Ligand binder design. Sequence first.
Ligand SMILES: *[C@H](C)[C@H]1/C(=C/c2[nH]c(/C=C3N=C(/C=C4\NC(=O)C(CC)=C4C)C(C)=C\3CCC(=O)O)c(CCC(=O)O)c2C)NC(=O)[C@@H]1C
Ligand SMILES: *[C@H](C)[C@H]1/C(=C/c2[nH]c(/C=C3N=C(/C=C4\NC(=O)C(CC)=C4C)C(C)=C\3CCC(=O)O)c(CCC(=O)O)c2C)NC(=O)[C@@H]1C
Ligand SMILES: *[C@H](C)[C@H]1/C(=C/c2[nH]c(/C=C3N=C(/C=C4\NC(=O)C(CC)=C4C)C(C)=C\3CCC(=O)O)c(CCC(=O)O)c2C)NC(=O)[C@@H]1C
Ligand SMILES: *[C@H](C)[C@H]1/C(=C/c2[nH]c(/C=C3N=C(/C=C4\NC(=O)C(CC)=C4C)C(C)=C\3CCC(=O)O)c(CCC(=O)O)c2C)NC(=O)[C@@H]1C
Ligand SMILES: *[C@H](C)[C@H]1/C(=C/c2[nH]c(/C=C3N=C(/C=C4\NC(=O)C(CC)=C4C)C(C)=C\3CCC(=O)O)c(CCC(=O)O)c2C)NC(=O)[C@@H]1C
Ligand SMILES: *[C@H](C)[C@H]1/C(=C/c2[nH]c(/C=C3N=C(/C=C4\NC(=O)C(CC)=C4C)C(C)=C\3CCC(=O)O)c(CCC(=O)O)c2C)NC(=O)[C@@H]1C
Ligand SMILES: *[C@H](C)[C@H]1/C(=C/c2[nH]c(/C=C3N=C(/C=C4\NC(=O)C(CC)=C4C)C(C)=C\3CCC(=O)O)c(CCC(=O)O)c2C)NC(=O)[C@@H]1C
Ligand SMILES: *[C@H](C)[C@H]1/C(=C/c2[nH]c(/C=C3N=C(/C=C4\NC(=O)C(CC)=C4C)C(C)=C\3CCC(=O)O)c(CCC(=O)O)c2C)NC(=O)[C@@H]1C
Ligand SMILES: *[C@H](C)[C@H]1/C(=C/c2[nH]c(/C=C3N=C(/C=C4\NC(=O)C(CC)=C4C)C(C)=C\3CCC(=O)O)c(CCC(=O)O)c2C)NC(=O)[C@@H]1C
Lengths: 157, 157, 157, 157, 169, 161, 161, 161, 161, 161
Amino acid sequence: SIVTELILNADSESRYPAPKEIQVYQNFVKTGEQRIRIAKILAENEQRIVQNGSARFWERVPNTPSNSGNERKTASCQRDQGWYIRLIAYSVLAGSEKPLEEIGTIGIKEMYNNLEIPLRNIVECMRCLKEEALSLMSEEDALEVSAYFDYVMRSLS
Amino acid sequence: SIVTELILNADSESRYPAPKEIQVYQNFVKTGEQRIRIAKILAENEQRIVQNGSARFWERVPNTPSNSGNERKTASCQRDQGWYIRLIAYSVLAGSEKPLEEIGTIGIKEMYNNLEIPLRNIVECMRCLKEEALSLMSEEDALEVSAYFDYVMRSLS
Amino acid sequence: SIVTELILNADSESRYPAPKEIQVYQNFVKTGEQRIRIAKILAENEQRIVQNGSARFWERVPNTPSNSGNERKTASCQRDQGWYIRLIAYSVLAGSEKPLEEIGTIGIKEMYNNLEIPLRNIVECMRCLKEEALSLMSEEDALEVSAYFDYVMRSLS
Amino acid sequence: SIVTELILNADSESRYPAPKEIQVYQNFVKTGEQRIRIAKILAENEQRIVQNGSARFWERVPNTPSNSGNERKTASCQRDQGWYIRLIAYSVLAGSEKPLEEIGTIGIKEMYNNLEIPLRNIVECMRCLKEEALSLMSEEDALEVSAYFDYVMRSLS
Amino acid sequence: MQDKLTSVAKNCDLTGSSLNREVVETLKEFLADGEKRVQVAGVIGSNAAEIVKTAVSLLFQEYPELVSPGGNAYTTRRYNMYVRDMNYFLRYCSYAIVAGDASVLDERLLAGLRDTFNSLGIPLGPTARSIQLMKNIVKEKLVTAGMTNITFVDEPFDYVVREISETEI
Amino acid sequence: MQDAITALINSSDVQGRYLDPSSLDKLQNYFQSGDMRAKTAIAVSANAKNIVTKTVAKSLLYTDITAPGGNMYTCRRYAACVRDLDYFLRYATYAMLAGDTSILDERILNGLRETYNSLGVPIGATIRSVQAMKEVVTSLVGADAGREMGVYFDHIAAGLS
Amino acid sequence: MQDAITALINSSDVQGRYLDPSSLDKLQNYFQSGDMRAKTAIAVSANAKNIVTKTVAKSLLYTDITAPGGNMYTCRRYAACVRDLDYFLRYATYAMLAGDTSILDERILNGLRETYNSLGVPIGATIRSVQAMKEVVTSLVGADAGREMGVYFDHIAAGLS
Amino acid sequence: MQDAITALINSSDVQGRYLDPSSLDKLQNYFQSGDMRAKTAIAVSANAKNIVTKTVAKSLLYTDITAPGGNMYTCRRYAACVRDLDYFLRYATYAMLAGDTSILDERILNGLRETYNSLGVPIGATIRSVQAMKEVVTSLVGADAGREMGVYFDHIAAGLS
Amino acid sequence: MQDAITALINSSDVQGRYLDPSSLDKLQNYFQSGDMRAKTAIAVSANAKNIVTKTVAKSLLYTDITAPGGNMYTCRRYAACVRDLDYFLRYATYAMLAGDTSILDERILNGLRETYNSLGVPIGATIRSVQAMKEVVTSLVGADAGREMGVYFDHIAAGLS
Amino acid sequence: DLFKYSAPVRKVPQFITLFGSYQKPLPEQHPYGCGNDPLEIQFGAIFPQETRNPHPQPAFFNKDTRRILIGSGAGSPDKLNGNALGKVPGSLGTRVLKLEPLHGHQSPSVNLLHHSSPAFIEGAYRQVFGRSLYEGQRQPLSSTESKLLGGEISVREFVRQ
Ligand SMILES: *[C@H](C)[C@H]1/C(=C/c2[nH]c(/C=C3N=C(/C=C4\NC(=O)C(CC)=C4C)C(C)=C\3CCC(=O)O)c(CCC(=O)O)c2C)NC(=O)[C@@H]1C
Ligand SMILES: *[C@H](C)[C@H]1/C(=C/c2[nH]c(/C=C3N=C(/C=C4\NC(=O)C(CC)=C4C)C(C)=C\3CCC(=O)O)c(CCC(=O)O)c2C)NC(=O)[C@@H]1C
Ligand SMILES: *[C@H](C)[C@H]1/C(=C/c2[nH]c(/C=C3N=C(/C=C4\NC(=O)C(CC)=C4C)C(C)=C\3CCC(=O)O)c(CCC(=O)O)c2C)NC(=O)[C@@H]1C
Ligand SMILES: *[C@H](C)[C@H]1/C(=C/c2[nH]c(/C=C3N=C(/C=C4\NC(=O)C(CC)=C4C)C(C)=C\3CCC(=O)O)c(CCC(=O)O)c2C)NC(=O)[C@@H]1C
Ligand SMILES: *[C@H](C)[C@H]1/C(=C/c2[nH]c(/C=C3N=C(/C=C4\NC(=O)C(CC)=C4C)C(C)=C\3CCC(=O)O)c(CCC(=O)O)c2C)NC(=O)[C@@H]1C
Ligand SMILES: *[C@H](C)[C@H]1/C(=C/c2[nH]c(/C=C3N=C(/C=C4\NC(=O)C(CC)=C4C)C(C)=C\3CCC(=O)O)c(CCC(=O)O)c2C)NC(=O)[C@@H]1C
Ligand SMILES: *[C@H](C)[C@H]1/C(=C/c2[nH]c(/C=C3N=C(/C=C4\NC(=O)C(CC)=C4C)C(C)=C\3CCC(=O)O)c(CCC(=O)O)c2C)NC(=O)[C@@H]1C
Ligand SMILES: *[C@H](C)[C@H]1/C(=C/c2[nH]c(/C=C3N=C(/C=C4\NC(=O)C(CC)=C4C)C(C)=C\3CCC(=O)O)c(CCC(=O)O)c2C)NC(=O)[C@@H]1C
Ligand SMILES: *[C@H](C)[C@H]1/C(=C/c2[nH]c(/C=C3N=C(/C=C4\NC(=O)C(CC)=C4C)C(C)=C\3CCC(=O)O)c(CCC(=O)O)c2C)NC(=O)[C@@H]1C
């Protein structure tokens, strides 16, 4: 959350929040309604985003562990897509990428290397999901959604 | 300014400005007209603010170097009041307390202790100047100015 | 005490006391009787020192909390003067400013800023107390007492 | 080189080479005949190894930029294979992986990601090259070669 | 708890020096003053209430704010607690004078005293002052009784103060 | 640490599901209270040293604590008590801004009791000081914001016992 | 560091006077251009890796600089060159957002030529690659934003010269 | 660390009083004994190596401690035991010079038992060695100064037991 | 640093081709000389102290350098010169074992002349000391190994001049 | 504490421990309590939580107590012989990470130090952080690493950053 970031930044200097940080806090809490609306949009459309993104991802990358005939692998890939959509919704709510980075980005390469999932394929799937999500949203609301999808893609690459 | 602050925040992590910094930047540039108007108000009314604040300050703290029969000391105190109003106008224009911090807050205690000027007297004078300045501003235009006056007073105490 | 300083200086180098430390120790042990006499002089003349120093201090610096008509504030200031005379007597006994530094100098600025007592006024009061205490002793007896008073005054600035 | 490693191991302790390091040095210089023979084997059979490994790697991974129909990309890939065989020959001659690590392992992922070449494909090509090179040498003779190929693959992964 | 003889005898086996010359000399020196220790304890026990009353009255003279409203000796409840605790201190100091050893003070007087006083907000400065006042009164009574070499009487009281007082330097 | 938004996010995340309507309502409540929280933080920042001065005058001055032999005797121990009070005030402001007491538990309270016991600091006196600080803040700011800050002051006091 | 607003503020402050109307007009111009500057920063952040790979492909690849004995030979030197180009792009974006080249002169060009001369890095090849990066960015973000970033790319090239 | 003067000053300071005649008499006693204390410090410093040599010879050598499997076996452990005896002698000299045992409480005995039990150092052999060192020092500096140093040697030994 | 093998690898890699038959011949020559190099290193390791003693005795002793006002006056400067000679001998042995002089350039001669000039260390005396050290090593290890070590001693002397 | 309802929740004995420690000198623990002593492991700050399985044993450590520490015996041989008598299991004795400072032509392809640059950087990270960071976590410090590799900053400055 951006509030935690501001408080920790102030605390590292052992000082009360500066007027600029208070302005940042006020501007963030001012826009809470739009963030809640965007998170609700992502939550409602998560399944169709996952379905369409999976269709595009399997059309574009057919040689992937998801569509290797393993039902469990397909289900796990779908669940991972839903989980990353949920984490992006969390980040939209918090006004910062801290939820997404602390739940699904720090150590993502280690986890997926241990799982033996190609990282390029995950990047392609994330791109397809980002396109699907940006389809079902206005551009002004999709700014942070695209930014956080790009954050995931950069963390994987 | 806040632009430099957010650029430095992005640079501290060696990455491009995140959507939080971009939102801060957009909210700052959308208030440029208001900040220019507030700075113009401060510049136009600087003299009357100084005179009224100094009158209230000498009423509240009669025993202070700025009124002891020394014309030069009185002139220097009123010059300091005008200078701090100018620095607060700079801070309003910049969207951050940084200009005031560099020009008249870092080492303010050392400078005024070298001059043998009591710091709590300056705090009272800044309080009177804040009261005078906020009474010629809108209700919403007084938030930033009040924050910067509080910043000066806190740096003094 | 100077003995503790010598022992700690030797311990800093993990060695037995060098001839310089031994010579300092022997000189201090020789002067101990004079130190006891000076401490007795300070103890038996504390009240008149406080009274005369307070009179001179209020004549020189009339704008102090101790001279604001508040009986409690005056009593507290005179108690502080007595306490500092007691600490200087301790330091005379110990041959070093260690008692005065540990009990009444470290954190003196923070304590008196919390109490909102101007530090310049305390410096002036210490100067007056030093002037009144030095008149009660010989020059060689006053040699160390003046140094301890100067130590308090320097710590207050 | 392991001679440099022995010298610097003795240097970190600021001492002349110990008998253990001298024994290692003598054992190493006694294997120069075999190391030069292996390097000659790699130099003579570089082209056939490159061709066979390219054929097997394109059979295993048909969708790669090396055989995407661009002759320049194919030539660059085959040149890279030859270069890595050369680096492995250098490492065999030196007795350690340090030459290979310094020339074609530090920053290999960044270089190939800038070139936009999937790293898994390069791992597969390295595996094919390793299996082609091992077949041209006897056991107890190609242990270091396989180790260096594994080193390249591990750096890529 | 141990007295001087018990501690010395146990240390004789502990240190491996057995009953050497220094131990014999210390034992003889201690036994030389045993009758005086018994006499001092008898004087303390025969005048305990007077000693405690005098010391507490002098304490309230030197700390007049203690008995004022908001003070720690405010009300008869807290006054009685003052008298009770000063009697505790005097009794255990008399014990330590008899035994010639401070282990009784360590085990039954000072163990956990600071924790209790912090829990109850009992000020330690006045406690040390009251102990010193009781010591001075005991010394005066011993001088009146005619005792001459009573340096050891200082040892418990001072020790207790050093154990309860905070570190200033 | 962890604020209100992060607390709700983690409550949803341990179950692996999006924020349920109750959590969304709580988040909206925090978003609406953010303005009051910012104003209170500004007020406390402006008068931090004055707040601590009033706290010390109200709860510690002219007691046996500052008398010779007391724990606030000598200038260094007085300044140390003032430093601890400054820490308490700053972190109460942090917790009020965050809407959560997590930072107080993490940074201030986890080990303070054993530290005070080792140092001999009277815990009852410091609890009374924290309550006096709560009174001073509620007099400076107001009733509603004073109560909001008093929530975290009370959490500090409970963690000190 | 210093940006456009701070530059104007310092220009006024060195004379001890408020911002004159010309400075206010320049400030208004910067405020009006801020939206486009933020849009360019977002685009460059999104396409940073693509910009750097296109720069290398069209400037340094398949020349003597990557052949053995060249300064971009071996993987570590290639990675170092790519990292340097990433630094150039990121700090040019910082300078474009700030509206001033002070960040470039403080974090990039201060001693860069001396360092490159010490290492043997070819200055001409670096300048050519900076020009190629400017062209790539201009292609990506359009004409106006392209030349806005090209101002700072040319500043980098001049600093290297 | 406190010496005799600092201890008396502390006892007077917690009461907020000047030094009473009893503490002044104690201070005069310390000042009178200072010359003997300095002489004893000089004597112990001049013979520190010989004191430790004789202590080891008469308390540790040719026992099972120096035999293989003993705690003074190997050169490192022998040197460490000699170093520890040096520590004890030096800090006993410090305490004798100060006229107070607080230095031993704060720098020698604090955690010494836990450290020795963790390392396997024999506590009883250490106590016997300290007793032997006290006997050697007494034979070297006489009965009176020997007893004065033995006060602090016995403080160390009692702390170890 | 580099040794013979690494130097050949570098020379081959700059031109991007395998070791040509001449480089392989040089590599075989180094491999054959490895045994003599090991024996020489063992001998110099065994007699390093005597080598430096004889070097100082025949090069620097009983001159104006060791007299008051000279650069080898005081024990600290004498020990520093002896330490520098130790460095020269040890790194010459390292270079002889490696077959390359790059260790001397990187670790010894890199800015040594400037350090000596700033400190005031006579360069000519140091060169004479290095030559005397070469003579001593030659007298100790023989003519062939003597000249093998003399190559690196002469490299040090030339890098100093 | 026994009369409170949380008495059956504390498992560590509270009476026998205190009664035993009454007879002993200061414990081997942090002056702020046993809860201020982390586990001495490779990485991770593991502390006793006050409220979970509570077993705090405060002691009255004054401001001048100095802890007794067991030396590990690690360090370079030149920085030894003053505290070489310590020995702790799991100590890499002479394996300290040291980087000599760097002092118009490009470097050779293969230049070998004791540790390669990535190996030294990983060692520095493993010492400062206790363990290797994850993949992307080193991104903010890349420029710093560059300044360490180019000799702009020392290892001390790199550690500070
Ligand atoms: C007199 C020279 C100046 C001054 C004095 C003044 N003092 C107070 C109150 C306090 N003074 C102290 C001082 C000390 N505490 C310590 O531990 C030590 C070290 C030995 C010192 C010197 C303290 C703690 C207080 C607070 C009250 C208390 O004792 O509990 C006041 C304030 C009185 C009030 O209540 O308003 C004043 C005014 N005033 C002057 O004008 C002189 C310059
Ligand atoms: C072949 C196994 C794989 C393949 C490779 C490929 N490489 C390039 C281009 C380049 N390769 C290099 C290689 C190196 N440079 C070094 O310094 C080292 C260390 C010794 C190496 C290995 C370089 C520099 C280039 C760039 C061009 C140049 O040489 O100047 C290409 C073409 C890239 C392009 O877009 O033109 C290709 C295709 N591709 C595969 O699919 C294989 C797995
Ligand atoms: C003031 C309200 C009361 C008081 C306080 C007091 N504190 C100290 C000293 C210390 N207090 C702490 C506590 C903390 N450690 C932490 O990590 C935090 C959270 C950030 C806190 C609050 C510490 C570490 C110290 C340091 C002790 C030292 O000197 O090393 C003192 C001084 C004690 C001393 O013996 O010097 C005091 C007086 N005491 C009162 O009586 C007030 C009621
Ligand atoms: C690429 C366009 C060209 C190139 C680059 C190259 N640079 C280095 C080495 C360094 N580069 C820098 C630059 C910076 N470091 C910083 O932190 C910053 C500011 C954020 C800058 C601008 C530095 C300091 C170095 C030296 C330290 C290091 O190695 O990291 C190399 C490596 C050279 C070598 O011999 O190792 C290279 C190759 N070289 C070209 O040929 C391109 C034209
Ligand atoms: C003989 C070459 C020289 C010499 C020796 C000498 N040693 C002693 C006594 C002891 N020697 C040791 C040695 C060691 N302890 C260890 O742990 C190790 C490493 C494994 C060694 C080498 C010890 C412990 C002693 C003390 C006696 C004991 O047995 O406990 C003596 C006797 C000294 C005395 O009686 O005081 C001697 C003479 N003496 C020479 O002249 C030779 C040069
Ligand atoms: C000799 C009389 C006995 C003996 C001693 C012995 N000690 C050690 C090791 C240590 N001794 C200490 C003690 C201290 N360090 C301090 O700083 C202080 C305060 C000034 C003291 C008292 C410590 C810390 C150690 C640990 C190692 C170190 O030097 O840091 C050893 C070696 C133990 C080991 O093997 O590590 C020995 C043998 N042993 C006997 O048998 C004698 C009776
Ligand atoms: C005499 C007590 C012992 C002794 C001495 C001895 N010394 C030398 C030669 C030299 N002595 C020095 C000494 C110093 N140089 C300094 O800078 C200082 C610090 C002020 C000192 C003490 C030096 C430099 C030399 C070298 C000769 C010169 O002066 O240039 C010798 C002769 C050595 C030789 O091999 O020729 C001797 C014999 N010898 C004993 O037996 C005594 C124990
Ligand atoms: C002896 C042959 C001559 C001599 C030498 C001398 N040198 C110094 C000081 C330094 N010597 C060095 C050299 C090195 N340090 C290293 O780490 C290495 C590589 C392993 C080398 C070659 C350095 C760096 C210094 C300066 C720092 C230091 O003193 O350690 C001195 C001391 C100078 C002074 O006045 O302090 C001396 C005397 N001097 C002669 O006259 C001989 C001819
Ligand atoms: C995996 C098999 C199981 C698992 C592990 C797990 N561990 C952590 C975090 C830590 N692990 C350690 C352990 C060590 N510290 C050391 O010094 C060493 C020796 C080198 C080891 C093995 C530590 C200290 C931590 C703390 C955090 C850190 O990384 O510093 C976690 C993360 C827990 C968290 O809340 O952060 C996990 C998950 N957990 C399982 O469920 C597996 C069965």
